[PDB]
């Protein structure tokens, strides 16, 4: 797709295109921003 497309794509070398989301604004944005880092209770460490 990057070869045949005219639409700009993400300009980060070692990231697949599938790892990026399209924001409501036109520009791309990585999915990694939308995944929080949480803390799990000791009660449910293996069955959350």
């Amino acid at each position: 797709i990057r070869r045949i497309t005219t639409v700009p794509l993400p300009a980060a070398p070692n990231i697949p295109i599938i790892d990026y989301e399209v924001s409501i604004s036109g520009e791309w944005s990585p999915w990694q921003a939308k995944v929080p880092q949480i803390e799990v209770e000791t009660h449910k460490v293996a069955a959350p």
Binding site: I1, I4, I24
Partner: protein, 436 residues
């Protein structure tokens, strides 16, 4: 020791064809027989082996009877055309100056081409040109039905073409479906998945609705989802009472005609894989008897308004007895091009509001064009603008087409079908405009 054995290895095709063609009144029968007989064996050898092909002698005799019928129809056509003018009429004189080869090739094409796969149709036409040189089959023109097809296709967001265009093959296939429904009282569509057989049948019913002023009703049944006992109804082994099955219930409903069902036209469509088990009772109906027999002992006579139809991805497990009784139209996968589906998508976007749901579904039929409703909602405007942005990429050689052709090369754990990918893409674009 008690039985005398005789080797009937090879019947005389040529002389049987000669005598039958002479029986139908053909002036030339020797040349026509000597041409048609090798042609059938040529088709049997050259064409790819498929279960539904039948180039045996029964098929040949049926084709020749059809050719005789077409010849007589042409005699009557010329006779009535001259009679409406001022003329002196003689049947023999009219029959003298006609091409018999044109009638025969027309009958052969009309009987075979609907069953032909898209891979085999050009081979068949090459063979036909070889055996019948300088003779071509021009398809009979159905102007009124084609105009109604155009109207319904524009109404249902479907492409229409006049042959050798974008969508010509699909129009031809629905016309063939009309022909087979006219001829036979039972027929099948045996294309692969995603070839437009169910859409073609729906369009045909809604077009004959306008053409003939007769109300089209559809009864779609999945036969394998339901058990055979519920399908055909089961007799209680004790405390004797009859429980009508679904198919028997539909047949009894149309036969009784409480709401005037005899006036209306009703088609029963078995939209599911054909198997020997659930079609045993249907064999009597599909045969020339046209009679459903049940363990209850009741004998339901199929009325002329009913037309038992079939949709199958394939007929791998269909008995030859079931295939023989029914007509058939093979909807090859290259009847629905990618451009047709993209046009359907972009046409659905421009006129179906994406949020209003089902309450406004009925209002779609209230307006024949929905004038003054261009701004039905802001959603319609947004998705129309989105379709305008998306049109350059949906072209016949655009981004989507090249991407799909490349993706078909890639191996997928599940079988990669065209319409699965296209429906996924359309749903994602729907959600894109919803996000906007």
């Amino acid at each position: 020791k008690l039985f005398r054995s005789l080797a009937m290895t090879k019947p005389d095709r040529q002389l049987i064809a000669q005598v039958m063609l002479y029986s139908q009144g053909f002036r030339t029968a020797e040349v026509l027989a000597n041409k048609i007989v090798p042609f059938f064996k040529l088709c049997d050898e050259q064409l790819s082996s498929q279960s539904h092909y039948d180039f045996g002698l029964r098929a040949l005799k049926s084709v020749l009877v059809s050719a005789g019928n077409v010849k007589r129809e042409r005699i009557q056509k010329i006779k009535r055309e001259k009679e409406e003018r001022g003329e002196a009429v003689d049947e023999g004189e009219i029959a003298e100056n006609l091409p018999e080869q044109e009638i025969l090739i027309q009958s052969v094409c009309e009987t075979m081409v609907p069953k032909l796969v898209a891979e085999d149709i050009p081979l068949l036409f090459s063979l036909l040109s070889d055996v019948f040189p300088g003779v071509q089959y021009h398809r009979g023109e159905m102007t009124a039905l084609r105009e109604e097809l155009k109207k319904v296709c524009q109404e249902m967001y479907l492409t229409y073409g006049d042959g050798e265009e974008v969508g010509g093959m699909w129009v031809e296939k629905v016309l063939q479906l009309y022909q087979i429904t006219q001829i036979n009282h039972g027929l099948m569509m045996v294309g692969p998945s995603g070839s437009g057989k169910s859409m073609a049948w729906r369009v045909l019913l809604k077009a004959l609705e306008r053409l003939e002023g007769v109300e089209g009703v559809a009864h779609i049944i999945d036969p394998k989802a339901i058990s055979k006992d519920h399908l055909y109804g089961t007799l209680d082994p004790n405390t004797r009472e009859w429980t009508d099955g679904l198919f028997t219930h539909v047949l009894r409903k149309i036969i009784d005609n409480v709401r005037g069902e005899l006036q209306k036209r009703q088609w029963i469509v078995f939209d599911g894989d054909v198997d020997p088990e659930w079609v045993e009772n249907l064999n009597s109906v599909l045969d020339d008897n046209k009679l459903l027999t049940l363990p209850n002992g009741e004998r339901l006579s199929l009325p002329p308004n009913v037309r038992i139809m079939f949709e199958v991805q394939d007929l791998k497990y269909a008995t030859l007895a079931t295939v023989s009784r029914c007509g058939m139209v093979w909807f090859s996968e290259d009847v629905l091009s990618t451009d047709m589906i993209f046009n359907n998508f972009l046409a659905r976007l421009r006129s179906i509001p994406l949020d209003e749901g089902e309450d406004e579904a009925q209002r779609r039929r209230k307006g024949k064009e929905d004038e003054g409703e261009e701004a039905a909602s802001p959603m319609l405007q947004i998705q129309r603008d989105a379709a305008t942005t998306l049109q350059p990429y949906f072209t016949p050689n655009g981004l989507v087409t090249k991407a799909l052709e490349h993706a078909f090369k890639l191996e997928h754990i599940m079988d990669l079908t065209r319409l699965r990918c296209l429906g996924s893409l359309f749903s994602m674009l729907h959600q894109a405009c919803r996000n906007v």
